[PDB]
């Protein structure tokens, strides 16, 4: 079809806002670093700008599972080469994975499908690395796989893969045997070469492999991977997260009683000397002083007996990093107790690059804010600079450039080192037509942000209410200072927290109303979708659990809406405050009494998501009324199973819709400022049009469409959120599931 080149940039959050399970340093080129994520692809570091660049944005709609990066290897012989094991789930949520290969540090990729699933967003994703390159003969790669698939090898630089049938343990541990998520074998855990057992051009003969099997977890080959044997004398009862070999011949291994990233309530650290055969338990803590696994393992390349480990997960008051300079014989903690509850610290956190990491709470010794971290499954020391470490948490990448201050009685300065990283899952987006913000987001895990300059990190976490995930946000079109968001309050932690927040100042400050939807038996857990009347004189809340409710009393009371099914999608008219719209299971609904009463209209052909194995309350539906035009509604969504997929337009308040004949599939719709000389708002859609999957803009009410993204800027399964900017022609805001929010303008 037609295309128009655009400039695609990230909306900056400073910290990224998702879990980084692996950071991978190249072993021969200084400052060559990669980072991998569970749902958001991978990144490469740029030392000149102290920032990361995504190497995954070519991943698109059909091949979306490539953004689950379960393992990554960087070539020490030719550092232009990099490989990834990708695929997101190993259960019924996903299809088979693949090994991706690049000869230009991730600028471009080729791919080899694997005949099994890869688990970038499965349990144990911070154990590793499970994809490795022979450091003496770099056409050889090994991959340790999930689900009983065992050990795989390539001898042609990643093009072709075959099972290593002589590997004798495919794993035994299963995290969630009774669930539909993680009921498969975790499988193999990490692979570590002994480079001293090969020479350039000749296969490395000694290879170590960790396996998620508490009874027998560490394996070695000494004949180049022909024969594999469990290490005699190894400890039992735990799961090794990492195995790293020092030049002393000591193999260091961290263990947890889980594979993580969220669990681990007991742990050990061991070393095994490859020459003497001695095993030594060097666990930093033990007995009642240990209630957590050990996860991250970092050896110092310059000082062979210096190493660090992190807890996984202590959870309270914070995690601990432990440092040893004598091979684990003695350890120093990065913080200690004083007179309880006081603590002393060998570190200081600096979150000036992402000040919202304090979650809006006041720091105390027992409730530190910001924390050192959590989910610290990967901890790394720069092999070319003992003063630099990096580690991943569930929210960011932290690092230091004065690490060895620890050894001289000083404090380690830890700062956000995630510039360029955006990992959030975007549940909703609004671009208010007035005020200092053009973009307020609804995000998983870190709630969402009010953005002003899209290159500057937000200064504030969303509080009062404070929650992990905002499912939905809307604003009053005629009074955009009034806006409402809904999420799910953690009432175990804060029983007075509500799952709805209201703002009268454009989203800068929020308050919680005096009541929430409830029935005779329970109050809503929240989530669902929210719509705000044109004038702000009412709120409609389609809750996740107990149906649709309206309030005309600013949330002082809520009343169940008549006629609209529980789980319905909802939308307010942007002109007429009495008018709302609903949709469920193929039927369209209208209310003309402010959300109190809904009546069906006649609209046909919408995906029912209710025939031939489909479920209505999990449909892909984007439905919005148009700013400035009463009764004008666009609807995108559907699927191929029903042959009900595309983009529909109503101008009579939902009484009838025209299905656009020139849009084969569509999943999202949004609006922005009209083009010069046009009166109708520009349309932005995520769609398949003229045979091309992408992001498209129409300046003529859908008569013609131009693709405004391209094959290098696809962002995987972009069925999350989209809007134009009512104040900036051409501007699009695109939500993603693991790449944060993008904004883009014509070239
Ligand atoms: O706890 C294990 C172990 O503890 C042993 O005791 C030792 C231990 O004691 C701790 C307790 O100390 C008490 O003080 C004592 C002291 O112990 C004693 O020595 C001294 O002498 O005397 C003192 C005074 O009595 C203290 O009073 C207790 O409070 C303390 O207990 C800890 O309390 C922590 C804080 O709790 C408060 O806030 C949270 C509320 O829930 C509580 O009600 C509040 O009280 C609590 O920390 C939180 O832990 C959770 C995780 O908990 C879970 O795992 C650990 C289990 O212990 C726990 O039962 C279980 O519930 C953290 O939650 C996580 O938060 C992260 C970050 O936000 C989330 O990550 C994000 O996830 C998303 C994905 O999310 C989805 O998928 C995951 C799912 O979980 C989620 O819902 C989904 O949405 C991802 O995408 C993102 O990337 C990622 O960032 C994550 O989801 C979420 O789960 C939470 O943050 C913490 O605040 C502690 O758990 C609790 O233990 O330590 C001291 C030692 O001396 C003791 O010996 C026991 O002996 C043993 O039996 C055993 O219990
Ligand atoms: O039994 C499930 C169990 O899951 C626990 O949560 C764990 C689980 O979370 C999955 C979600 O991960 C997010 O990523 C996290 C990431 O894990 C972190 O590392 C990072 O820091 O933060 C990220 C953001 O928070 C993703 O953003 C989510 O998308 C993902 O949700 C699951 O997504 C899959 C895939 O579908 C999506 O991706 C492809 C695209 O094609 C699709 O359109 C997208 O929606 C869904 O698969 C579908 O499942 C339905 C049936 O779903 C029902 O059963 C499972 C429930 O989870 C659902 O709520 C329920 O509706 C099926 O019919 C379809 O065919 C499938 O396509 C899943 O449904 C989504 O759940 O894994 C990562 C781990 O980190 C989390 O701890 C959770 O704590 C438990 O309560 C429990 O729910
Ligand atoms: Cl004190
Ligand atoms: Cl303004
Ligand atoms: Mg680019
Ligand atoms: Mg690592
Ligand atoms: Mg602060």
mmCIF file of C-alpha atoms and ligand atoms in Angstrom, residues 21-25 34 36 72 126-129 242 244 297 377-380 390, ligand 6:
data_model
loop_
_atom_site.group_PDB
_atom_site.id
_atom_site.type_symbol
_atom_site.label_atom_id
_atom_site.label_comp_id
_atom_site.label_asym_id
_atom_site.label_seq_id
_atom_site.Cartn_x
_atom_site.Cartn_y
_atom_site.Cartn_z
ATOM 1 C CA UNK A 21 16.374 -10.806 34.002
ATOM 2 C CA UNK A 22 19.719 -10.713 32.226
ATOM 3 C CA UNK A 23 22.616 -8.381 31.571
ATOM 4 C CA UNK A 24 25.370 -9.816 29.370
ATOM 5 C CA UNK A 25 28.885 -8.342 29.070
ATOM 6 C CA UNK A 34 23.444 -6.311 26.234
ATOM 7 C CA UNK A 36 17.368 -8.884 27.814
ATOM 8 C CA UNK A 72 21.396 -13.945 24.796
ATOM 9 C CA UNK A 126 16.839 -14.969 35.312
ATOM 10 C CA UNK A 127 18.880 -18.186 35.602
ATOM 11 C CA UNK A 128 21.511 -18.255 32.884
ATOM 12 C CA UNK A 129 22.835 -17.584 30.478
ATOM 13 C CA UNK A 242 24.272 -19.220 37.925
ATOM 14 C CA UNK A 244 30.729 -18.801 36.994
ATOM 15 C CA UNK A 297 26.413 -14.042 40.865
ATOM 16 C CA UNK A 377 18.397 -12.512 39.599
ATOM 17 C CA UNK A 378 21.279 -11.101 37.576
ATOM 18 C CA UNK A 379 24.190 -9.131 38.998
ATOM 19 C CA UNK A 380 27.248 -8.268 36.933
ATOM 20 C CA UNK A 390 24.931 -3.462 36.902
HETATM 21 MG MG1 LIG B 6 24.194 -12.111 33.421
#
